[PDB]
Amino acid sequence: MREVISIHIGQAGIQVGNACWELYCLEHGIQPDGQMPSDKTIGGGDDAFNTFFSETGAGKHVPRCIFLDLEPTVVDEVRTGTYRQLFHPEQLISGKEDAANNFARGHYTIGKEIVDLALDRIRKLADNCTGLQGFLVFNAVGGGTGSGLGSLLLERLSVDYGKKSKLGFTVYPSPQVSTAVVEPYNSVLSTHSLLEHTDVAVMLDNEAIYDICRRSLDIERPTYTNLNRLIAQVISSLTASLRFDGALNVDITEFQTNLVPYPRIHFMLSSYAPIISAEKAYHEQLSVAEITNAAFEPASMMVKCDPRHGKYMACCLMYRGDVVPKDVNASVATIKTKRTIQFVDWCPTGFKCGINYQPPTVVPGGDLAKVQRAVCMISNSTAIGEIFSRLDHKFDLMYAKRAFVHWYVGEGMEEGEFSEAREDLAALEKDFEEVG
Amino acid sequence: NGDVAGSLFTSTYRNVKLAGKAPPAANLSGTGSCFDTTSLSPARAGAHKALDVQKDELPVWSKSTLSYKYPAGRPNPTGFLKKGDGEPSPPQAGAYKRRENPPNTAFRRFYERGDLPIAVDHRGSKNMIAWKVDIEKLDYHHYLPIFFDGIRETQEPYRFLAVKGVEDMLRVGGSKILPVIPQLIIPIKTALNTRDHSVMCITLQLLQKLVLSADLVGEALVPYYRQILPIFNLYKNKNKNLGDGIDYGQRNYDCLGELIADTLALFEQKGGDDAFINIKYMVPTYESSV
Amino acid sequence: MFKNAFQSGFLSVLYSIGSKPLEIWDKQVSNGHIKRITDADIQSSVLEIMGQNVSTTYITCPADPNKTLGIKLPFLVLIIKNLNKYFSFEVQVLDDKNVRRRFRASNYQSTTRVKPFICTMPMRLDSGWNQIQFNLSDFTRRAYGTNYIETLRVQVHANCRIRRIYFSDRLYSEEELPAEFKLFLPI
Amino acid sequence: PDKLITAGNFNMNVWTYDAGNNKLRPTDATLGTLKRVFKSVVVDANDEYAYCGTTTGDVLQIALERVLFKNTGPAKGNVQMGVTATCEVPTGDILVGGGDGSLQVLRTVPEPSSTNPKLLRKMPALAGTKVEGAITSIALADMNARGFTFFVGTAMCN
Amino acid sequence: MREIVHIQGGQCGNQIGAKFWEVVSDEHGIDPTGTYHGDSDLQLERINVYFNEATGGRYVPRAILMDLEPGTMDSVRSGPYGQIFRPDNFVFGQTGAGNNWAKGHYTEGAELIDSVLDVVRKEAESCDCLQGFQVCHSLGGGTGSGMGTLLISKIREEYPDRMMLTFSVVPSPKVSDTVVEPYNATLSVHQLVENADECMVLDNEALYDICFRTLKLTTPTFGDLNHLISAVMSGITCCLRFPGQLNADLRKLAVNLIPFPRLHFFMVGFTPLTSRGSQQYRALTVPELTQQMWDAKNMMCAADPRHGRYLTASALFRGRMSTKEVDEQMLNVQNKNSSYFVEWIPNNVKSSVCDIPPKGLKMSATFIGNSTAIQEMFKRVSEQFTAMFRRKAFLHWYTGEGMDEMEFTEAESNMNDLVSEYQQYQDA
Numbered sequence A: 001m002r003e004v005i006s007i008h009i010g011q012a013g014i015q016v017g018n019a020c021w022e023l024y025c026l027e028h029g030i031q032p033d034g035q036m037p038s039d040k041t042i043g044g045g046d047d048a049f050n051t052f053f054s055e056t057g058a059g060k061h062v063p064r065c066i067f068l069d070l071e072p073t074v075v076d077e078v079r080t081g082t083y084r085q086l087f088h089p090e091q092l093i094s095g096k097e098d099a100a101n102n103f104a105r106g107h108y109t110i111g112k113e114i115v116d117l118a119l120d121r122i123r124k125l126a127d128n129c130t131g132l133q134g135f136l137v138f139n140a141v142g143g144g145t146g147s148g149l150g151s152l153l154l155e156r157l158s159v160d161y162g163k164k165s166k167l168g169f170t171v172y173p174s175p176q177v178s179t180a181v182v183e184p185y186n187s188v189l190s191t192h193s194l195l196e197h198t199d200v201a202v203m204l205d206n207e208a209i210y211d212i213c214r215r216s217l218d219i220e221r222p223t224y225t226n227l228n229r230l231i232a233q234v235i236s237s238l239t240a241s242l243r244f245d246g247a248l249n250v251d252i253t254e255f256q257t258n259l260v261p262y263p264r265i266h267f268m269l270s271s272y273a274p275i276i277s278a279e280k281a282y283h284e285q286l287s288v289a290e291i292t293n294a295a296f297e298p299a300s301m302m303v304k305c306d307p308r309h310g311k312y313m314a315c316c317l318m319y320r321g322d323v324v325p326k327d328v329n330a331s332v333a334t335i336k337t338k339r340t341i342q343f344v345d346w347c348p349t350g351f352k353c354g355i356n357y358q359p360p361t362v363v364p365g366g367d368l369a370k371v372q373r374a375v376c377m378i379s380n381s382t383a384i385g386e387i388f389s390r391l392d393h394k395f396d397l398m399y400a401k402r403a404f405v406h407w408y409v410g411e412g413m414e415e416g417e418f419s420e421a422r423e424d425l426a427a428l429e430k431d432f433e434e435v436g
Numbered sequence B: 001n002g003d004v005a006g007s008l009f010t011s012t013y014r015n016v017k018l019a020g021k022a023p024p025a026a027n028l029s030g031t032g033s034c035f036d037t038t039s040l041s042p043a044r045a046g047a048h049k050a051l052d053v054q055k056d057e058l059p060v061w062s063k064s065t066l067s068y069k070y071p072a073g074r075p076n077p078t079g080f081l082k083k084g085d086g087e088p089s090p091p092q093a094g095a096y097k098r099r100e101n102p103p104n105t106a107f108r109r110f111y112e113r114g115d116l117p118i119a120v121d122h123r124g125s126k127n128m129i130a131w132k133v134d135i136e137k138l139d140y141h142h143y144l145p146i147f148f149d150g151i152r153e154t155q156e157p158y159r160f161l162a163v164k165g166v167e168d169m170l171r172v173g174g175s176k177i178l179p180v181i182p183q184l185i186i187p188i189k190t191a192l193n194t195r196d197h198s199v200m201c202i203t204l205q206l207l208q209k210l211v212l213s214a215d216l217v218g219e220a221l222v223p224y225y226r227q228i229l230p231i232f233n234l235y236k237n238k239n240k241n242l243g244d245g246i247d248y249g250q251r252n253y254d255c256l257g258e259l260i261a262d263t264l265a266l267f268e269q270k271g272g273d274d275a276f277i278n279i280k281y282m283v284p285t286y287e288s289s290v
Numbered sequence C: 001m002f003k004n005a006f007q008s009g010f011l012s013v014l015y016s017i018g019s020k021p022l023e024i025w026d027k028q029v030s031n032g033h034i035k036r037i038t039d040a041d042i043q044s045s046v047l048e049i050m051g052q053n054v055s056t057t058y059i060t061c062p063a064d065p066n067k068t069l070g071i072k073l074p075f076l077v078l079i080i081k082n083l084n085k086y087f088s089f090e091v092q093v094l095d096d097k098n099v100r101r102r103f104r105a106s107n108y109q110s111t112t113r114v115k116p117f118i119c120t121m122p123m124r125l126d127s128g129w130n131q132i133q134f135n136l137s138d139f140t141r142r143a144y145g146t147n148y149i150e151t152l153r154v155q156v157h158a159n160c161r162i163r164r165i166y167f168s169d170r171l172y173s174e175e176e177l178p179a180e181f182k183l184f185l186p187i
Numbered sequence D: 001p002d003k004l005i006t007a008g009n010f011n012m013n014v015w016t017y018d019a020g021n022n023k024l025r026p027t028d029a030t031l032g033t034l035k036r037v038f039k040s041v042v043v044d045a046n047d048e049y050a051y052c053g054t055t056t057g058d059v060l061q062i063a064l065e066r067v068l069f070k071n072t073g074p075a076k077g078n079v080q081m082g083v084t085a086t087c088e089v090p091t092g093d094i095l096v097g098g099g100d101g102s103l104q105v106l107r108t109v110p111e112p113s114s115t116n117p118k119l120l121r122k123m124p125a126l127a128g129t130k131v132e133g134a135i136t137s138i139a140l141a142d143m144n145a146r147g148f149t150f151f152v153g154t155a156m157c158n
Numbered sequence E: 001m002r003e004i005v006h007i008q009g010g011q012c013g014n015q016i017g018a019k020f021w022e023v024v025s026d027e028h029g030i031d032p033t034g035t036y037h038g039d040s041d042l043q044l045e046r047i048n049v050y051f052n053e054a055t056g057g058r059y060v061p062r063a064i065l066m067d068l069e070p071g072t073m074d075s076v077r078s079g080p081y082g083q084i085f086r087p088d089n090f091v092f093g094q095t096g097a098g099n100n101w102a103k104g105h106y107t108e109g110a111e112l113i114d115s116v117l118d119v120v121r122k123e124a125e126s127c128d129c130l131q132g133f134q135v136c137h138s139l140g141g142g143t144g145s146g147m148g149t150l151l152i153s154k155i156r157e158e159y160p161d162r163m164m165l166t167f168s169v170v171p172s173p174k175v176s177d178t179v180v181e182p183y184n185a186t187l188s189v190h191q192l193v194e195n196a197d198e199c200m201v202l203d204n205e206a207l208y209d210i211c212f213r214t215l216k217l218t219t220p221t222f223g224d225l226n227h228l229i230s231a232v233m234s235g236i237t238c239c240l241r242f243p244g245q246l247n248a249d250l251r252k253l254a255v256n257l258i259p260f261p262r263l264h265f266f267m268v269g270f271t272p273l274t275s276r277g278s279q280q281y282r283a284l285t286v287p288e289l290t291q292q293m294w295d296a297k298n299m300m301c302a303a304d305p306r307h308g309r310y311l312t313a314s315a316l317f318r319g320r321m322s323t324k325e326v327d328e329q330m331l332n333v334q335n336k337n338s339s340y341f342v343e344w345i346p347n348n349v350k351s352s353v354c355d356i357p358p359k360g361l362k363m364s365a366t367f368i369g370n371s372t373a374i375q376e377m378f379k380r381v382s383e384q385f386t387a388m389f390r391r392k393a394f395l396h397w398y399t400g401e402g403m404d405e406m407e408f409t410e411a412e413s414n415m416n417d418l419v420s421e422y423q424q425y426q427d428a
């Protein structure tokens, strides 16, 4: 009834999907072998996994997801890993050859011949859904697959549905830490196609989350799995209101109505709190006010943006666990009296709050600890234009010399794509400015 | 009349969630995930089952009393006497028993292979159909029987797709429908032969839509009454006797006792000057509505 | 097998170029031999099978019996060299009714004779390399007046040199074919 | 004798007394979107299933390894004034007495639903009777000749 | 006679309706099974105002439960008092409201009203003398506002003579749980003014204070707030249900409170309200109940009476008392605070009285007041609306349902016209 379709493209997408589809199968008691035991059943009950699974004719729960990739090697690790009895092999789509960090190879040459089977898999998976809340894309801007595929995918998806809503969770090239040399090119190229097609698009980067895991959890040895775990926790806290009960339920339709005032402006920040180890939680009480201050702290964001250089066009809070509405109403009042946080004049309101009674779960062997509360903060603030201007600068600093342009012009592209994406980014920055 | 596409999901939810009512027990053997194609069973639906009653449970006829009495008990050594001693109905036939409806239809198999130009259209305000091509230029001879053969389905989204398929093709059909009638009788009869209320209440509304979809369909259907009315004769008198209780359920179409009366009136309406006798021959309780 | 897969424009079952082309094929030789050699006309590898007693040296598409090759694409195309010898091949078909027909084409035969389960027909091969296309859905309609559903088994007998076996789903032209799915005979 | 279950208005918990300190840790009950005002609670002989009456009239039986809920209550109806005085007969069945005088016997053995095999039935009712007034207390007396004699104190002081 | 049908729109409206039907079901002493187990005959004399008979001596409520996203309707069905509703008095749709008043009132509302009207007609005809309607809105969400008004407009053009109530919960002036909330408020008001006869306005913020100061509740959940809305909603009708030395039908409350057709936004309050400690010391007399009700705190709306004057008010007592006391109490209050009333209205309070009190209490009362203080509430919203509409924020959603801009401009002007009328009769 309330189901989502979760795509994971590229490597980062299907890496974070490992954590996501481990967290879900653990939160709902599903064993790695498709089926949950007979004990966890509660008489007659559904819609607890319907959102993230489809029950087969007998026993197995197959996840309603897709793992698309052009590098065979990660889909093979998934096929051989412990979570292989879960996925029916026809879900994990692979390819003999990768894009090799070329947006052209992703969007014009190689993905053009596998979008057809991707769309057929999506057809077969979305007809199975009675009430489709939406597609959740897990792109990874900065790689060849991600950049070209997610773009071509969204073009086809919008020409098919259009009215249906697409939410994306993209990683963005961090300004300081960057593991590519041409990635400004593909970021600029992906944005022009995604803005016009996707309907909401969160943004996050590895730098902020490294910092978060350093500050709070105090881990001197972070790896990509630590970032994946936090992304999975954020998404679980988000899709709670769809798959659970509690005061002030939240559905994607309303959530996107009351956070995107203008068609263009939909990029938004993210934040999660509390995020601590076991010893820390042992010396704490974790009031709702403490958690909301932690959430609204700019250092706890998952994107290298400063909100105090902009205002808040709106925001959104999704609590979890033991919460009551008076506490949230008192915390928002304190925050709106505060002065460091700005709000644009034309939104005297601006806090969509949701609650639910299902506490957050901890994955054994993970990094977080058990808590009775949690808050995920999502805000559409006009300050994010700085991480767009960074890449706007970088694109032309490289395009002036026209380095690496030969790859793109030989792989079925020309020069005009760069200029059109440049103009689009300039227009986007002008639009962001216009709202002051 | 009213559509059949929307009503079904809300009805199933109201029945299973709101009341403590049962699905009840829709067999999903051979069908796994949404990706793996099912293994079609060789059985057939609406099939009369053989008599299972034992050998001996059949009473024997006593020539002396003119009565069927059960045979006496053979002795047993464990049950021996001790010191102290001072002291047939026939096996009913499954007339109203829901036949077994396996998922081995042809619509499911064709949809699995992906040969159908249909898809679900979630972008609408509700569940709608979305055609890959233009309906009014399809080959009805090939597609329309396939869509009727999916009415018997109960697993989602097959039954929704099948009902919505016929519902939309009958609107734009027109003259293209009349020559297809001889091929629609078998799936209609098979859907009715299941004795299941859900499929029966659906196919009766589709049959109404069928006679209304075009002209001259009535006379053309008339020769085929001998193969579709035999079930009408059963549930013609399945009604609810509420007395003073107003029937809120009238909002949707669930009462067969009048879903059949409306359809028979419609048949007599369209069949011409001789449909009444062909009806009265199969269902004797019928009364001319002209 | 090949069920719940994706067949939309092409489906290549055999290709001489690869680490192991007879992945799914079973091979039975009695007085013959199978190998992969570099052809001269089409300067690439071709998998050749030869030997006496055509009816005994062959390769079946499904690895073993009791396992079907579920494939629903109408057109079937082979790329074969004509060695001017006895060559034949057979394809089994499932009709709309649950009956398994089978058609075979032989170059040592001169008359077609429809039968309840079999349809033998001659084949007029050209000289050297040539691609042969079977409608495989007009054939069932023309022979038994029924409809094509899906192929079940394919089998190719001796005295031929195979390069490509693929289902096409429609008659593509020499232009529309990709580079791998065509005959590029060099100088 | 180290764990104990307690029920109330909109809450059920199982508390275990820790050995290292003077603390006792609770574990809450997880029931699917059910809000029931539990009144009486009984535990079987082997700590398998906790039975709990309800003002609605249900007799919820839950497992106790994990405290989640299993079966709703008496089929073929529902107790009139809510379940008030509940007790267990050693044979594994439950005596239930509502707030109207309905005293009945529910045999609680996990049964499969006849029509839908992977589903359970509700608790049937072996015997039933009517006494004068709301039932408030039940105690047992093992006669063992035919059955058991239960002393039943009703709100009407009978 | 005087039977009344009850509607519940939106999630909140469906939730407070779960209490209103739970409180009343205990008043007349029926069970969650729907069977009657009271003791007196007054439980049965006018039971037909709220229930229809059922087979086997059961009573089911004359209620309608309308809301998209049937997830909420599983909740109320699963509550301890869900088993009394007829499971076919449930109209719903799988698609969401999304807090977009447009789709709740243009696209997905038009798909259900034809079914709802079928249901309300069915049990409008189940009443011998149907008194009127009453709903439960939430002017923030899209279901309550969007569907409610569209439904109401339909009823008005079908049952003009009858009377329509509305227990609409207004948005909060300080608190805004949603963001497009002022859009949903103003657009609904453009419908209510011409398509209603009495419209109580209630705000959860004042419900939090009342639970905080008076009731001394630590953690007021939404149940307690709903527990208060339930309390008053029962207090309005005890005349229709129970004997009374001066009974007050709803139509005579109307004519005594709305001198002009448009000034039909009321202000409500309940009494007695004490904690468990104060209950031991306070004594229950007419004086206590009238000073507490005439206080500016018991007003469950976010409006200050002292910033206005009561055009008219009305108090309803239930509990065996003396009519003389309540007759002079409303006199004294009318004398002292002569600035808090008007001059062209000689006596501007009506003091009804009932003979049967609440279940466990012995004296109780309910305050209803048509003051010009409410004009503050509409003033506030008319800014938050004109704030974002000046910037056309979030408006693209509303154009997405065939709407236009004229609809807003007309809607806003309707309130500015309205609040202007509340000033004319407030000569300060």
Ligand SMILES: CC(=O)O[C@H]1C(=O)[C@@]2(C)[C@H]([C@H](OC(=O)c3ccccc3)[C@]3(O)C[C@H](OC(=O)[C@H](O)[C@@H](NC(=O)c4ccccc4)c4ccccc4)C(C)=C1C3(C)C)[C@]1(OC(C)=O)CO[C@@H]1C[C@@H]2O
Pocket: E022, E023, E026, E027, E215, E224, E227, E228, E230, E231, E232, E234, E235, E272, E273, E274, E275, E276, E279, E358, E359, E360, E361
């Ligand atoms: C010993 C004693 O008298 O206890 C009282 C009591 O102390 C007080 C504090 C009660 C109590 O109310 C509360 O504690 C409360 C909590 C949250 C929100 C509102 C109330 C009481 O629950 C409320 C209850 O009152 C009723 O039953 C009313 O008739 C009321 N009933 C309900 O709302 C109700 C409905 C279903 C199930 C349970 C209660 C009512 C009011 C209007 C119309 C019909 C019914 C009674 C007498 C008491 C308790 C139990 C403590 C009060 O409530 C009412 C409405 O009577 C709170 O202020 C009053 C003053 C009472 O003195």
Ligand SMILES: Nc1nc2c(ncn2[C@@H]2O[C@H](COP(=O)(O)OP(=O)(O)OP(=O)(O)O)[C@@H](O)[C@H]2O)c(=O)[nH]1
Pocket: A009, A010, A011, A012, A013, A015, A016, A070, A071, A098, A099, A100, A101, A102, A140, A141, A142, A143, A144, A145, A146, A147, A171, A179, A206, A224, A225, A227, A228
């Ligand atoms: N947060 C997080 N980021 C990751 C993870 N794995 C990879 N990334 C980042 O993803 C980006 C590269 O994405 P890829 O998917 O490998 O590139 P691609 O889109 O597949 O393009 P090709 O390499 O040509 O196939 C790099 O910036 C990685 O740091 C992960 O597990 N967690």
Ligand SMILES: Nc1nc2c(ncn2[C@@H]2O[C@H](COP(=O)(O)OP(=O)(O)O)[C@@H](O)[C@H]2O)c(=O)[nH]1
Pocket: A247, A248, E009, E010, E011, E012, E013, E015, E016, E097, E098, E099, E100, E138, E140, E141, E142, E143, E144, E145, E169, E171, E177, E178, E204, E222, E223, E225, E226
């Ligand atoms: N008294 C009370 N008010 C509520 C409750 N839940 C929500 N409200 C308010 O009702 C408004 C939301 O309306 P809602 O019905 O959920 O959205 P809709 O479906 O689009 O109409 C919000 O202002 C909520 O704060 C509740 O449980 N009790």
Ligand SMILES: [Mg+2]
Pocket: A010, A011, A071, A101, A143, A144, A145
């Ligand atoms: Mg990559």
